[PDB]
Amino acid sequence: GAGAIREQLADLDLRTIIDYSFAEWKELGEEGSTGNEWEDRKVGRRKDFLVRRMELVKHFIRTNIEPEWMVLCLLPVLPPELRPIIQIDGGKLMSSD
Amino acid sequence: RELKNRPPRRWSQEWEVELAIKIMSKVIELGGIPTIGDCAIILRAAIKAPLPSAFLIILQTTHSLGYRFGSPLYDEIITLCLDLGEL
Amino acid sequence: NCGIPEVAFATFENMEFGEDYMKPDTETYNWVIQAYTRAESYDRVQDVAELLGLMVEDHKRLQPNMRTHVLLVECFTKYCVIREAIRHFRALKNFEGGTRLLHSQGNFGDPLSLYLRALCREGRIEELLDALETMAKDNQPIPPRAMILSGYEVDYMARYISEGGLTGERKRWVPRRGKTPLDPDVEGFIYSNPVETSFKQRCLEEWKIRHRKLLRHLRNEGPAVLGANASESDYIRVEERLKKIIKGREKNILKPKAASKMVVSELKE
Amino acid sequence: GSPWGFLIGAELTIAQSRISLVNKIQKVYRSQGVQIHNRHIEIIVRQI
Amino acid sequence: MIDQYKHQQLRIGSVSPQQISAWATKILPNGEIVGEVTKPYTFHYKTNK
Amino acid sequence: RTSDAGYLTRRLVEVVQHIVVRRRDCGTIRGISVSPQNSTMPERILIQT
């Protein structure tokens, strides 16, 4: 279930992730390739994945937001009056979905 | 500007081996003692070249231990032991 | 000195696009540079790049001073733009204030500790010696905070009377794996919001990595002119063998080339 | 060189794109008898 | 000519569970919290209360 | 043809809504230079430019 996902979110260290993704980017950048179309387009997607990974991780590092909050555990509920049940004469009710 | 093309050097351990006595000079010109990370690193930085300098002098303040025994000097043909005589 | 960076920038924009008399001064750029390098959150290195660029473009009226190099050394070292720092450090070098002002007091994260520590952990060691000679000119000693690292018992039994794991119950000796968005290492003391990179025991890095400059010229076609020789394959073969470590072949100095000459010829050739 | 070179190249590309786009936009309106000053076109083209 | 500075702000971010609890939980003087909303009782089958 | 025109107006404004005249001379020396004697632009498009 989501418990393992949340615990994993609460486990990996952001700085180590940045270092490892930088190392992977350096490894990918030092390969020529340019011989096969599949090889032509395989490196680009992985490099973009790494770049957005370090972008997100660096944003997480220097902010007041914890990753574990994306896997929520407590659900807020909208105020009642903003989702009212209309009282009509005779007992008719126009509630909210 | 000249730095953009000069080749500094290849691997050569002559001044980095002398750094231990160099940093000792550059730090004890003021208030600071090369120890722990500059004394327990000497035992791993001692065996670089057949030059006893910057190793037999580390014991002037406190150490007098090295890596527990001092077998060097008596383990280098090069030139014979140049009168170590730690006393 | 208000924490929020974009309260001083709004003042700066009131001067950059202002009238003749209210144009920014060399002291003004120092204040805005300082206000951006010690922000408590969010990335701030790109905005420092703008300010340097604007200062560079408006140069026949504005000239840098000691504090501009000092702040740029601090700002470029906190985030890992070390190269960009070493360069600037040099400039500071030729100022009579030395690194004492760059060190300032022990506050602000002790920027002089950052420059010394960060040079070691990345690979730049020859300039670390250059730094040490510069402090010995006028500055007070290497900061104690700059000196912290992780046969005889390396697990000493002697140190553990002097850091907390002793008769005093305040066990200040470091634990490990404490979770939270904090730092379990020391990486200096607490500062330099990125992570410290690992220089391998002051061994292989930045000497094999410097050599890429030598290999850059041989793998590049346009930067190398050479002569006629065997069309355009003499120097290429040197690159082919230089990539795969080293296998003898000390024939001669086949490259003998310069690096772009820093020349900008308008028309052609 | 590389630092000079692409500063030059990007500035040239942006200039050519602006010059092409302004005329391309204005031709459609001038072919239908519609008169609008180039300020309104250029304000949008700069953001493009 | 110093302009009329006006610094306004608008942040947005995911909330911590403690933030939601502080948002909603109301503690009576007797010590009860009872912010959980345990039952799905929309309106009484009786009077519309 | 009136709905598409209305949709284009929404997008045209969206790009430029923050563009406000905030200051006098910003201190620029680069100016777009035009050549009227090229005899390319008629003297009704040249004038309006």
Q: What is the DSSP string of C129-158?
A: HHHHHHHHHHS----GGG-------SS-SS
Closest CA to A9 of A57, A63, A76, A74: A57
Closest CA in chain D for residue F41: D23
The tokens for C54 are 């604007």
Which positions in chain D touch C263 (Cβ < 8 Å)? Answer: 1
Closest CA to C68 of C46, C45, C95: C95
Closest CA to A53 of A12, A1, A6, A10: A12
- List A93's β-bridge partners, or say none: A87
Resolution (A): 3.2
Q: Do chains A and F touch (3 or more CB pairs under 8 A)?
A: no
Shortest alpha-carbon distance between residue F49 and chain C (Å) = 27
**CB-based contacts of B45: which residues, under 8 Å, 6+ apart?**
B17, B20
Which positions in chain A touch C181 (Cβ < 8 Å)? Answer: 14, 61, 66
The tokens for E24 are 């909603």
Phi, psi of B81 (to 5 degrees): -55, 115
Please state, in angstroms and rounded to a whole number, the distance separating the CA atoms of residues C137 and C130: 11
Shortest alpha-carbon distance between residue C103 and chain B (Å) = 15
Please state, in angstroms and rounded to a whole number, the distance separating the CA atoms of residues B36 and C147: 9
Please state, in angstroms and rounded to a whole number, the distance separating the CA atoms of residues C216 and C231: 19
User: Is E7–C19 a contact, with Cβ atoms under 8 angstroms apart?
Assistant: no
Phi, psi of C196 (to 5 degrees): -70, 135
- Say which of E23, E42, E48 has its CB closest to residue A76: E23
DSSP state of C263: -
Experimentally, how was this structure solved? cryo-EM
Please state, in angstroms and rounded to a whole number, the distance separating the CA atoms of residues C211 and C15: 46
Please state, in angstroms and rounded to a whole number, the distance separating the CA atoms of residues A64 and A59: 10
Task: Calculate the alpha carbon distances from D42 to B26, D9, D21, D46 in Å.
Answer: 63, 21, 9, 6
Closest CA to D37 of D29, C98, A84: D29
User: Is F16–D47 a contact, with Cβ atoms under 8 angstroms apart?
Assistant: yes
- Say which of B10, B30, B37 has its CB closest to residue C147: B37
Radius of gyration of chain A (CA): 24
- List E40's β-bridge partners, or say none: none
> Which of F20, F21, F23, F28 best tests the C interface by mutation, with the highest count of C CBs <10 A?
F23
Specify the residue for token string 């498009």. Answer: F45
Binding-site residue set of F: 26
The tokens for C201 are 């025991």
Query: Is F27 in the C-facing interface, judged by CB distances under 8 Å?
Result: yes
C83-93 vs C66-78: helix crossing angle, rounded to 10: 160
Per DSSP, helices labelled H in F1-49 are: 2-15, 45-48
Query: Is F21 in the D-facing interface, judged by CB distances under 8 Å?
Result: no
Shortest alpha-carbon distance between residue C55 and chain E (Å) = 22
F19, F21, F23, F25: CA torsion to nearest 10: 100
Q: Which residue type occupies C217?
A: H
Please state, in angstroms and rounded to a whole number, the distance separating the CA atoms of residues B56 and B70: 9
Radius of gyration of chain C (CA): 24
**CB-based contacts of C14: which residues, under 8 Å, 6+ apart?**
C22, E1, E2, E3
Please state, in angstroms and rounded to a whole number, the distance separating the CA atoms of residues B72 and B49: 11
Please state, in angstroms and rounded to a whole number, the distance separating the CA atoms of residues A13 and C194: 12
Q: Convert chain A into a string of H (helix), E (strand) and C (coil).
A: CHHHHHHHHCCCCHHHHHHHHHHHHHHHHCCCCCCCHHHHHHHHHHHHHHHHHHHHHHHHHCCCCCHHHHCCCCCCCCCCCCCCCEECCCCCEECCC
> From chain A, which residues contact E within 8 Å (Cβ)?
63-66, 69-70, 72-74, 76-77, 85, 87, 93, 95
Please state, in angstroms and rounded to a whole number, the distance separating the CA atoms of residues C76 and C245: 33
Q: Which residue type occupies A84?
A: P
Closest CA in chain A for residue C243: A30
Q: How far apart are the first and last CA of chain D?
A: 28
Q: ∠ CA C261-C265-C269 to the nearest 5 degrees?
A: 90
How many other CB atoms are there within 10 angstroms of residue C122's CB atom?
19
A32-62 in b/e burial notation, b at 16+ Cβ within 10 A?
eeeeeeeeeeeeeeeeeebeebbeebbeebb
- Say which of C179, C193, C195 has its CB closest to residue A62: C193
Q: Which residue type occupies D23?
A: N
Q: Do chains C and E touch (3 or more CB pairs under 8 A)?
A: yes
- Say which of D35, D37, D44 has its CB closest to residue F15: D44
Instruction: Confirm if C68 and C33 have CB atoms less than 8 A apart.
Output: yes
User: Is C195–A15 a contact, with Cβ atoms under 8 angstroms apart?
Assistant: yes
A26, A31, A34, A36: CA torsion to nearest 10: -110
Please state, in angstroms and rounded to a whole number, the distance separating the CA atoms of residues C232 and C237: 10
- Say which of C41, C181, C195 has its CB closest to residue A19: C195
Got the DSSP string for C152-186? --SS-SSGGGSSSSSSSS---S------TTS-SS-
How many other CB atoms are there within 10 angstroms of residue C255's CB atom?
15
Task: Calculate the alpha carbon distances from A71 to A4, A8, A61 in Å.
Answer: 10, 11, 18
Please state, in angstroms and rounded to a whole number, the distance separating the CA atoms of residues C237 and C239: 5
Binding-site residue set of F for Zn(2+): 26
**CB-based contacts of E4: which residues, under 8 Å, 6+ apart?**
none
- Residues 22-41 in D contacting C (C-alpha not used; CB under 8 Å): none
Shortest alpha-carbon distance between residue A73 and chain C (Å) = 19
Instruction: Confirm if C257 and C225 have CB atoms less than 8 A apart.
Output: yes
Q: Which residue type occupies C80?
A: C
Query: Is C267 in the D-facing interface, judged by CB distances under 8 Å?
Result: no
Please return the burial class of C64, using the count of CB atoms within 10 Å of its CB with bins 0-12, 13-18 and 19+.
Answer: middle
> From chain E, which residues contact C within 8 Å (Cβ)?
1-3, 5, 7
Q: How many residues does chain B have?
A: 87
Task: Calculate the alpha carbon distances from B39 to B20, B24, B43, B57, C26 in Å.
Answer: 9, 10, 7, 12, 45
